[PDB]
Amino acid sequence: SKGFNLANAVNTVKSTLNAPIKHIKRNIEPTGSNYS
């Protein structure tokens, strides 16, 4: 079989840099609370 591939490596790097986006967005999310 074939081993290392730079296109697959770049895809994995993009997935790694994209995974924590949802949690950061959730942290910066405004909730339904209005602390007047």
DSSP one-letter code for 19: T
Q: How far is CA 10 from the centre of its chain?
A: 14
Q: Which does 18 bind (CB under 5 to 8 A by kind): ligand CDL, another protein, none?
A: none
State yes or no: residue 20 binds ligand CDL (CB under 6 A).
Answer: no
**Closest CB to ligand CDL among residues 24, 28:** 24
Shortest Cβ 13–another protein spacing (Å)? 13
Q: Which residue's entry shows tokens 């999310």?
A: 29
Q: Which does 7 bind (CB under 5 to 8 A by kind): another protein, ligand CDL, none?
A: another protein
The torsion defined by the Cα of 24, 30, 33 and 36, in degrees rounded to 10, comes to 120
